Symmetry: D2
């Protein structure tokens, strides 16, 4: 209590508290400190089961408790992938009512029609520093030096990690006398944020020194020059991709569309065109889709992905096309940063959710990516199919 | 146990369980079922203190338990707003290490430099159906009729809601023979997703019948025509706004920048230009900022906003400018859908987090928006200031 | 010749030359001055017929001659518009081979199938200053003051012209403490650039003074704050429109598609979807079309529109849809700044081209807009139809 | 005269005339025809000095005469480039009054402050077909085969041209089962439109046949899949570049800014930020500049570039920054398709304008690009400086 009063008088700050007291009671002191300031008592945030010692060290600061997100599932979901095969029951954490049911309805239709074909198109994590040079003349020299000494930069970056591998520096953007080199890494099963920052920092320190020997002065202004692009919607991510780039598709027969979706293939194609394609074009949107962010969001929260990367997962294009025997229906997500180790996957509830998919640990990120894509297709098909019903009726 | 076997044999579906057995036990049964399919045991997801019966009816389906997100706070954060005044301790739920510490550092620097000036610029929620007409001739007629009969459409829309007010139908986009009317509503303290869908649907039925009397056949293809725009990044939202449009500002003197941020106003201006402005411009990004999505995400999860709306909050522009007396630093977030009742705010842990802000219930959505903007500035200032420190050092 | 030597020694500059000598010989002196510097003789740029006295005063500075652009035509083009009715032969000036022939082929198909239905959706010209305020608090006051005193601002702006009319100030954008008010004008038949700058300048001087009386200090940084948006591709123009917003459409029967286009309606829809819709989405394009800029460009050069406004005319969306009896095919151009008086319409060759359309002078801009839209449809249909042939064959 | 009547009766079409009569008289005949349909007489369009026979074969169809665009110049313009060195007088064809005067003012200010530093950053032309495959499985196979067999595709592509070199196929975009390979060519001094279409078509025929041997069926839907991107504004062009990518720079001392621009370096930086950067950001524009399209347009018309490529040249970013010794000012144009042979450069008046620059013919496209960038900077500097003058005055 004397500590609590020193917190109120601000002789001691909440951040330094963990060294004066145990970490378990550190959470209670912080929880009661902010309760007294706000004049409100809490019952729920203080009741959790995750490991507070490890959470403080890797996942959060100034911990006062935990929030609880309702967890449901959608399934069964038959997937025909390179890494995911069989039927999956997918966990989904959300506070939006009807979202899990919409995906679950999509999973059932897809599974009864043979499952989703899905493939990972690309797999990379990127970091794009901004480097200042004295003039455009140096910016050109800097760019051409990078491209011709890539193997040297690759050894320097890779000496910082047992798990990362630098595969490219492309594109290299120049605006005036500023250079934005997009370092491209393989990250194994980690999402790779921390690894690509450390590998790129050493790479940039090395470039700066090597160029200084050639009488060219540069310096990195910031390791993230907003050309990565990280946690913002960007054309560079839509085009070049980031994280996992995933495509999932199904072919449905006309009789399956009538039986399970209660509609027709031309209606589905019309809805997709008027809404997902034309509607996104005229409002200058980067999401030519209906529901990716919602499905990405629910699956990311359950499995401990970075919540801000829902921004990146909202990019993409749904294609629905009439075929002779029914529809072709596909989702394309060029920008899905996921991982099955590190980050939030270590928090206990999220670990269990990955275990229910068989996707926690090493050699599982590509499997998890394929599940992500199949789940998005299932849910995008459910939503687009339900809209085509109302479309048919009203017409 | 007999039922567990009937689930494995697929005699009964998981969705039908809540009525045969208690909803409390429905959750445990379908968790045993997912455990037996994946052949793995769980220990943590089964712990939940939240009310499962109402969560099943309003927030989730096929519930098996709960995910737990670590919850911290950042503060103190002094805010000079129209609705938020005083020092706030902002709760933040995240799994990303160091994020809360970065915002917590920003809150303290700003607080002892006088607090954050914040204003809500706009407050509205939108729904934009796709309407098919026979031809551009009818599409033009439709647009003009909407503009002419707006008051009547307004009364039909408002008859479905006690809090919703239809204030505009603008812009009204036409592509070929397709019409995308952007209905603009006031929603009170709700985020407004469900209110604007019910109000817009009856309005569209009324437009369709009134036009049929003039022998003009239209029909709504979908109540969401992707011109809203909802849960996607779009120029219409960046320009016209959606949800709350928030702006936060601070003026810092050169002596405060040196003492608290360990840098100068020139370096902060330089970082912001090269990274937030030029960097976003050349990569064709709509987020001319460093950290909005990260901060929005942590606050949205803690307070029960919709997770997919982090997409909308990642839009915006950070401005940092050298002034005679220091630096001017501001964030602009034109597209922040928040609510203090309904949706996920009902979930107990998230409700308590709104209570810690004094932002649960009616007449508090604008207070909450001002807190959101002040927190984003605090963290955006922390990050940019930390980058300008490295910037100066490497220059020397 | 003594003047020529003073030009070489730079005692006198080319700009001040018109007061020392006649304007006719001013052009010859400038032409020979730059010839001597470059050590090349010219024969063509010096042979023209346009009025040099008026061109110097309204269209060009430092004139040395004229460039000649080949002029052809496309037709007949039957148009079913509110202002354009009947068959038109459209002049087109270009240096690209096959462009006029592609449009001419489209005009013939369309005319044999009943002509193009076209309508002007909107008609406005805009100017968006950037105004600096001391703080966001003032920026809000500034915005709310503008909206509540619009009638006062409208009288002030309109006192500068007999032809402009201020119809709106919307949207009003605020970034931090900077305010971007989009002034919206009717301009009659002029494109309106010069009128909206003069009307807006007086409007801003008045706002600045009125706000100063209320103890709020603002000042306009620039009358064009890049939110207009003028001569750049922008979502605000795509969504809110600028200049003329035009939509043209045709319905074609299946037998007409086979007979005149040598293809089918599903092929046309497939080409449009894969190329104009999906291809533009994945490359993050604002032109969901094939050929607008080319057709806009050829028609603008012939009739004296501002060449940089081809940027704005490249925006838009082509929709091609299977119907029970054939196709629906439409073009949407939300951003087409044109005029039938002022600007370049006064240069003699361009005046004649507008006369061939019956579109020079007052009360003709909307007629000309409808012709622009019908011409773009004709050419977009020709190009998309020719691609669907190769598509059918290769499949 | 008898033929004139057969045109009015539609017995013969205008296109068939060039073979029955001389092409010189074909032009006069079909002008009489358009005159008689519109019931109006023309006097000016019938004057042309250009070679009509070759223009009819390479530049135009259904020719009736010529349009005349007023031609001026701006100079002197001192350029410090890799390929352009010395003082240039830049010809500019326009109907917009005051534009040439604005650039002419910029050229003189820069010239006596030391000239424009300019560099060509990149030089390539692109064509991106749409290829349909049966499924994403085959689309992945197709992408990997292209990457694996690039050298063979390169030899097939280069067999169609003496100047074209295929240097890359990147990026290779996949949407569903559709594949958009961006072929990247060197084109010498041509703009490359026609060369990259012929080379890419044979390359695609070769890919299609080689995949058929492995029992994988693909087919090119169109040689231009709108991912090129050609004559539209697109992020892929802003990011990866197309045509010439040009950057021009000047450093100006505070004393030169005061004396020649009548302003200060702070005001220039402020205008550029509020207008070119923030203004373009909030309106979702891809042109973070004031005047590129205007200057590009006048130069493109004078020198015979494609008018529709003004769309591509309007992209880019202007940077103005306070330096210890004055201001740094630069323009970046990542997407400028130019050529010095072929296309419209052949037209006589435009050829003479290239000659006035010493840029007609082979080994001069890079010189011409450097001149383009220096002219855009000169005019962009003139405009922004003129806006900063008004800025300072109204502030006082
Ligand atoms: Cl060099
Ligand atoms: Cl106030
Ligand atoms: Na409740
Ligand atoms: Na020739």
């Amino acid at each position: 209590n004397e500590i609590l009063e020193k917190l109120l008088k601000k002789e001691i700050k909440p951040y330094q508290l963990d060294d004066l007291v145990g970490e378990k009671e550190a959470i209670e002191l912080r929880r009661k400190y902010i309760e007294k300031i706000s004049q409100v008592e809490t019952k729920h945030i203080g009741h959790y089961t995750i490991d507070e010692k490890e959470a403080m060290k890797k996942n959060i600061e100034n911990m006062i408790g935990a929030v609880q997100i309702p967890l449901g599932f959608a399934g069964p979901l038959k997937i025909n992938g390179k890494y995911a095969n069989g039927e999956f029951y997918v966990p989904l954490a959300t506070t939006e009512g009807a979202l899990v049911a919409s995906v679950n309805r999509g999973c059932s239709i897809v599974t009864k029609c043979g499952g989703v074909t899905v493939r990972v198109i690309d797999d990379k994590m990127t970091r794009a520093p901004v480097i200042k040079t004295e003039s455009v003349i140096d910016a050109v020299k800097l760019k051409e030096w990078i491209k011709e000494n890539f193997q040297r930069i690759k050894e320097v970056a890779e000496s910082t990690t047992r798990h990362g591998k630098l595969i490219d520096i492309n594109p290299i953007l120049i605006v005036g006398r500023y250079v934005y080199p997009r370092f491209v890494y393989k990250t194994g099963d980690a999402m790779g944020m921390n690894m690509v920052t450390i590998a790129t920092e050493k790479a940039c320190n090395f470039i700066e020194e090597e160029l200084k020997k050639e009488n060219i002065n540069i310096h990195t202004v910031a390791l993230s020059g907003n050309a990565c692009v990280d946690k913002k919607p960007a054309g560079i991510n839509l085009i070049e991709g980031r994280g996992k780039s995933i495509i999932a598709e199904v072919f449905l027969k006309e009789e399956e569309i009538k039986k399970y979706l209660k509609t027709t293939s031309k209606a589905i194609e019309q809805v997709n065109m008027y809404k997902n394609l034309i509607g996104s074009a005229i409002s200058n949107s980067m999401g030519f889709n209906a529901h990716y962010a919602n499905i990405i969001g629910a699956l990311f929260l359950a499995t401990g992905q970075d919540e801000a990367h829902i921004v990146e997962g909202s990019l993409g294009i749904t294609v629905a096309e009439c075929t002779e025997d029914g529809v072709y229906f596909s989702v394309t997500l060029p920008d899905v940063p996921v991982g099955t180790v590190g980050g939030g996957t270590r928090v206990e509830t999220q670990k269990e959710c990955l275990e229910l998919l068989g996707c926690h640990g090493g050699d599982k990120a590509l499997k998890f990516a394929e599940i992500v894509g199949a789940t998005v297709l299932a849910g995008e098909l459910s939503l687009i199919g339900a809209l085509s019903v109302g479309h048919l009726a009203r017409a």
